[PDB]
Design a protein around this nucleic acid. Sequence first.
DNA 1: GGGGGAAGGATTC
DNA 2: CGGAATCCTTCCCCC
Length: 341
Amino acid sequence: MIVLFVDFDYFYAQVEEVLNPSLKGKPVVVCVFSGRFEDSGAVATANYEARKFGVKAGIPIVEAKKILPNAVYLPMRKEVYQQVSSRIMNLLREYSEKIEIASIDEAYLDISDKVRDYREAYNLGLEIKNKILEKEKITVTVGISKNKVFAKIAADMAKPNGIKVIDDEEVKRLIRELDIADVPGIGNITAEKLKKLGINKLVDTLSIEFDKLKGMIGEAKAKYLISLARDEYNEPIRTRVRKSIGRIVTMKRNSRNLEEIKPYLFRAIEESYYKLDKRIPKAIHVVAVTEDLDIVSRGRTFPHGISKETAYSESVKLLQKILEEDERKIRRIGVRFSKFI
DNA sequence: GGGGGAAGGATTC
DNA sequence: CGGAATCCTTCCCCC
Ligand SMILES: Nc1ncnc2c1ncn2[C@H]1C[C@H](O)[C@@H](COP(=O)(O)OP(=O)(O)OP(=O)(O)O)O1
Ligand SMILES: Nc1ncnc2c1ncn2[C@H]1C[C@H](O)[C@@H](COP(=O)(O)OP(=O)(O)OP(=O)(O)O)O1
Ligand SMILES: [Ca+2]
Ligand SMILES: [Ca+2]
Ligand SMILES: [Ca+2]
Ligand SMILES: [Ca+2]
Ligand SMILES: [Ca+2]
């Protein structure tokens, strides 16, 4: 089996450049402003010029202006990045049939019935890696290996504007030389946990006992790391369909007043329904982020689809159920819809 | 014991 | 310090 992985480079910031070439060369920073005050939000993306000075996704806009006060701060425009993304996907879908769109900027192509030999694949990369830019002017990275995971790991290493292959021999070298923190699916919390057990390489997962491991990262996660280490990881490429659509907003003031919240919650719902498009959800969750950034949320599932009217109706019950089962003040409130018909 | 889910909390990105 | 979506873990009804 041969998996080819494409990943659009510094995507949001890269699109704002295609749309405004002048920016190419200068530090660009796409961010999300909440509203509580001027320049209050987080950074979503930054091109490499901005990154090499310490600006990366996740940090406070304030903390970034204090580093590159003279950088171009642009507001995020997801609807645009989504359309540009959709065109390229369709552009990718002309190489394989077996295709898995992971996110707005990633995709896995099972280029197996279209190719052989790694060399034959690599070439296919430089190809894809070139039609995209010809037609859309976007630069991407390609990674290719035996399974989904190593193909990604490859692309991570080989970025930016790269292409790279990890044959079966190189995989073996990695299963024992690569930091676990760098395995897809593993994050800060689970990462800073495997240490507490004495694991830093995929290979370690074989030493530790299954029950010990199973109890810090989880049974699913555990089985996942073991499989990669035994080199038994092999998941078919496929589809993936949004199983949930929702929206959350930050209120100008943290509050516990049902009347104050209601308007923000209703804005979330109306926005949510628009995105639902022609999909009927049978479940709904009200979601709230406390001021210490916790997330609490109550939902209800229905034996049939939900109408905006029922949605407006039920959400208020859920918003209360919450306000009761807890004590903290609310900062952000929103809704999520799932179990589509 | 465990299927089959709904409901609640935690993570990754 | 923002926001979207998924991912895991527990509780329940019952054969
Ligand atoms: N806290 C966050 N809030 C909003 N969006 C975020 C946040 N953290 C990360 N992201 C988004 C922005 C990007 O779409 C994406 C980052 O993807 P990434 O695949 O790691 O590639 P890269 O190193 O080439 O640059 P880029 O990340 O921007 O695409 O996730
Ligand atoms: N909750 C989740 N747990 C694990 N993987 C997820 C989750 N949600 C989404 N993904 C997957 C599918 C996404 O397309 C993919 C990655 O999104 P993304 O912004 O690219 O990069 P990344 O997670 O790959 O880390 P990096 O910052 O190095 O690029 O992760
Ligand atoms: Ca990317
Ligand atoms: Ca990506
Ligand atoms: Ca990254
Ligand atoms: Ca990592
Ligand atoms: Ca990232």
